[PDB]
Amino acid sequence: SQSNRELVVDFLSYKLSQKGYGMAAVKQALREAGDEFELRYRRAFSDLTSQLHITPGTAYQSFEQVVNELFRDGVNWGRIVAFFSFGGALCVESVDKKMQVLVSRIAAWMATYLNDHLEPWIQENGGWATFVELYG
Amino acid sequence: SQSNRELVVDFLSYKLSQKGYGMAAVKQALREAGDEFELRYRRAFSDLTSQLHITPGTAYQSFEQVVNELFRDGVNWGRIVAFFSFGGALCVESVDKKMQVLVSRIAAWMATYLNDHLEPWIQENGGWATFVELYG
Ligand SMILES: CN(C)CC#Cc1ccc(OCCCc2sc(N3CCc4cccc(C(=O)Nc5nc6ccccc6s5)c4C3)nc2C(=O)O)c(F)c1
Ligand SMILES: CN(C)CC#Cc1ccc(OCCCc2sc(N3CCc4cccc(C(=O)Nc5nc6ccccc6s5)c4C3)nc2C(=O)O)c(F)c1
Incomplete structure (x- = not known):
């Protein structure tokens, strides 16, 4: 979905910019969380x-196996x-190692995992909306 | 949940009995599928x-990792x-190796994975109810 992809791009851009490199309420709660x-x-x-x-x-399958450990007891x-924060860390670590090309790939992995x-x-x-009530 | 656990026990008992060892409509559709x-x-x-x-x-985590491969692309x-049929096969293979004690454990693994x-x-x-309309 486009809404999940938008949240991914917003969060990743926010994290990269933070480190030097619509859905307003959801994006804000997510950034803050x-x-x-x-x-x-x-x-x-x-x-x-x-x-x-x-x-x-690094293959998506590898990313998928690691993320599964995160949700092993459920969501x-x-x-x-x-999970969003983990994706942000992979992007930051990618830009550090001069592999800025991996950013868009990580973004796709996240959106894919979210949707699937x-x-x-x-x-x-x-x-x-419920996430906003609880974490926002 | 108790409803998931009931489906698991019904299917496993059905499979075990088939090999020689409420929710009526759901149980029937599931057995048939x-x-x-x-x-x-x-x-x-x-x-x-x-x-x-x-x-x-065998730990639940091992079972969980194998089942994850089944749903790697989604559900x-x-x-x-x-997944139900895989659990049935593990129970049959357990009763065949004289480890009938593993049946109730497999049942718990399935109910757990379903709920989580x-x-x-x-x-x-x-x-x-929708599964019944499609497969029943
Ligand atoms: C309202 N206001 C105040 C605003 C607010 C707020 C607010 C409050 C509380 C918050 O978090 C609470 C804990 C959330 C979690 S995480 C978790 N497990 C499951 C098991 C498991 C297993 C293996 C690994 C991990 C893992 O994550 N490894 C990582 N490695 C990296 C490396 C780099 C980057 C990121 C990561 S992540 C996990 C994570 N479980 C939980 C849980 O709550 O159950 C929060 F985020 C925000
Ligand atoms: C209408 N009436 C007449 C009633 C009916 C009906 C009806 C219709 C269609 C039905 O299934 C359609 C195919 C469903 C599947 S299975 C699947 N993959 C994903 C990739 C993948 C990867 C690795 C392993 C497995 C795996 O499963 N390994 C196992 N090993 C054992 C060993 C022992 C026992 C069980 C198992 S399972 C899979 C399975 N993908 C699909 C899919 O459809 O997407 C059906 F079951 C019933």
């Missing part, structure tokens, strides 16, 4: 960037925030 | 029983049928 996750929560959970070791040869809003695996839970749980 | 999968489709896909090699030491009714990963898609796609 991602920031909170990075400041307080990222440190406690298993570091997924260590498990992926991204490069131009919830906090986990979706960790997370969308049903999102819609069944009130949609993004 | 599972039979069609075994008669027509099982031969046309990769054998997951080869990837699990079940024993009393649909036919894939859910393949498949339920949202099911509800967003018309619920079990």
Whole structure:
């Protein structure tokens, strides 16, 4: 869906710009939730960037397997925030290693995973409007 | 949920009995779909029983990783049928190796995976009532 892709591009651009490189309410809540996750929560959970070791040869299937570990106990809003934040970290780490080409690929991976695996839970749980009420 | 667990126990008991060892409409459609999968489709896909090699030491996480391969591209009714049928085969193979104790465990794995990963898609796609209309 275009709405999921828009959220992905907005969050990734925000994270890249933050580091030096419509749906307004949803985008804002997402940006804020991602920031909170990075400041307080990222440190406690298993570091997924260590498990992926991204490069131009990295396949979507590899990304998919690592993200599955994130949702192993099911989906919830906090986990979706960790997922967006994980994608942001891969983009930042990609731009550092001079592989800016991987950004658009990571974006596609995220949108794809969202549409294929997370969308049903999102819609069944009130949609993004509900995320705003809880995290925004 | 209790409704998912009931479907799992009904299907497993049905498969076990077939090999010599409420929700009536859903249970019937599921039994019938599972039979069609075994008669027509099982031969046309990769054998997951080869990837699990079940024993009393087999962890849920192992089962989860194998099932994930089944839904790697997403969920649909036919894939859910393949999933029930896969659980049925593990139970049959467990009773054959004298490990009848694993049956209740496999049942719990299935109910768990259903509730944690498949339920949202099911509800967003018309619920079990829709499965009955299509496969029943
Ligand atoms: C309202 N105001 C105040 C605004 C606000 C707010 C607000 C509050 C709370 C918030 O988070 C709460 C925790 C969310 C989570 S994360 C999680 N697991 C599941 C198991 C699991 C297993 C393996 C790995 C991971 C993992 O994520 N590894 C990563 N590696 C990297 C590396 C780089 C970058 C990102 C990542 S992520 C996980 C993550 N589970 C939960 C949960 O809540 O259940 C929040 F985000 C925002
Ligand atoms: C109408 N009336 C007459 C009633 C009816 C009916 C009716 C109609 C259609 C039906 O299925 C259609 C195909 C469904 C599937 S399966 C599938 N892949 C994804 C890729 C993939 C990858 C790896 C493994 C598997 C896998 O499954 N491995 C297994 N190993 C074992 C071993 C033992 C036991 C079970 C199993 S399963 C798969 C399965 N994809 C699809 C799909 O349709 O997308 C059906 F079941 C019933």
